[PDB]
Amino acid sequence: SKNVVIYADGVYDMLHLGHMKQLEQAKKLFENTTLIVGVTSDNETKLFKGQVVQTLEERTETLKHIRWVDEIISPCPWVVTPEFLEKYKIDYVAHDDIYAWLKRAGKFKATQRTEGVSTTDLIVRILKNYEDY
Amino acid sequence: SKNVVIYADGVYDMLHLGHMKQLEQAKKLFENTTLIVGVTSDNETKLFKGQVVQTLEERTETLKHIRWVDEIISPCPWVVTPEFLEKYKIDYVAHDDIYAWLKRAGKFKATQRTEGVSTTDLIVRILKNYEDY
Numbered sequence: 001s002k003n004v005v006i007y008a009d010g011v012y013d014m015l016h017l018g019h020m021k022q023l024e025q026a027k028k029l030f031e032n033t034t035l036i037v038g039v040t041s042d043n044e045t046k047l048f049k050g051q052v053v054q055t056l057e058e059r060t061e062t063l064k065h066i067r068w069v070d071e072i073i074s075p076c077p078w079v080v081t082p083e084f085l086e087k088y089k090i091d092y093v094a095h096d097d098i099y100a101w102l103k104r105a106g107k108f109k110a111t112q113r114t115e116g117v118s119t120t121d122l123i124v125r126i127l128k129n130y131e132d133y
Numbered sequence: 134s135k136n137v138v139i140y141a142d143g144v145y146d147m148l149h150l151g152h153m154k155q156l157e158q159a160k161k162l163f164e165n166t167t168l169i170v171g172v173t174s175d176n177e178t179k180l181f182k183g184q185v186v187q188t189l190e191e192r193t194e195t196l197k198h199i200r201w202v203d204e205i206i207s208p209c210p211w212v213v214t215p216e217f218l219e220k221y222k223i224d225y226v227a228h229d230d231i232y233a234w235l236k237r238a239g240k241f242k243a244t245q246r247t248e249g250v251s252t253t254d255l256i257v258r259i260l261k262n263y264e265d266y
Contacts, residue, residue, distance in 0.1 A: 014255050017191070020198040053255050058150070065153040067200035122147050122186050123256055 004030040007090040008111070009038030009076050011045050012059045013052045014119035020066060025111045026094035027068035036088060037069050038076025048078065137163040140223040141244070142171030142209050144178050145192045146185045147252035153199060158244045159227035160201035169221060170202050171209025181211065 008026045012019055027035040039060050045052050054062075060074040077084060080093060085107065092109045093102050102108040141159045145152055160168040172193050178185050187195075193207040210217060213226060218240065225242045226235050235241040 014252070017195050017198075020195065024198065053258055062150050062153065065150075065157065065199055065201070067198060119147070119252060119255070122252070125186055 001031045003032045003034060004091045005034045005036065005089055006092050006094050006109070007036045007038065007080075007085070007088065008094040009040065009080070011040050011049065011052055012063055013054050015059070015062045015066070016119045017117040018114040020068075021114050022096070022111050023066055023068040026109070029092065029094060029109050034070045035068055036071040036073060036090065037063060039063060039072060039074040040078060041075035044078040134164045136165045136167060137224045138167045138169065138222055139225050139227050139242070140169045140171065140213075140218070140221065141227040142173065142213070144173050144182065144185055145196055146187050148192070148195045148199070149252045150250040151247040154247050155229070155244050156199055156201040159242070162225065162227060162242050167203045168201055169204040169206060169223065170196060172196060172205060172207040173211060174208035177211040
């Protein structure tokens with residue numbers, strides 16, 4: 001089977017099982033893939049999205065340990081462009097309109113977020129050992 | 134080169150970069166390895182070592198996403214025995230005396246812990262955005 005190049009991006013701050021399952025889902029969209037993961041910059045994430053604990057270098061270094069990841073673009077562009085898809089020969093973007101041009105090109109693949117498995121969720125579990133009263 | 138079977142074990146609660154680097158180090162002790170990772174049970178960890186946020190199923194499911202891991206024994210035994218090494222054909226145990234019999238057998242390989250990269254370390258960083266006064 002032809003090798004399909006998949007692109008996913010995100011912040012990947014305090015990487016947790018939810019990120020990992022989403023990367024697995026993107027990697028497995030076709031039988032033979034190359035999964036390219038883009039990691040957003042510190043400045044653009046903080047300006048447009050929200051707070052980030054870990055630096056780009058930390059977030060990228062953690063992601064390299066994840067089996068589904070074949071290539072990392074770090075930092076990646078904040079907005080995906082058709083030129084970027086051409087440059088990296090990307091067949092599909094795996095994402096969970098401004099995705100509209102991707103869907104119109106047939107280059108959009110849906111992935112899902114998993115609830116209740118995040119790093120902060122784990123800290124909330126720790127805190128629950130301490131009754132209010 | 135002959136394939137060398139490596140065994141590492143631990144709790145792997147809130148898996149973080151430090152665990153990942155230690156698994157990588159064990160996987161790379163020789164050029165061609167099989168890295169078997171043992172994940173300790175909830176009851177034995179809590180009784181003998183300390184508190185654990187995540188259940189065995191959670192800790193094991195997160196570990197399967199780590200590229201260095203070839204096999205997981207979950208739950209693993211709390212104490213490694215020579216019979217266990219024979220059963221799984223383990224050549225070396227990668228660990229950071231009661232290791233004495235392992236060193237005497239020539240089956241001990243040292244790995245290192247990384248400081249300041251744990252999950253709780255990240256939460257401490259979050260908290261530091263809130264001045265005491």
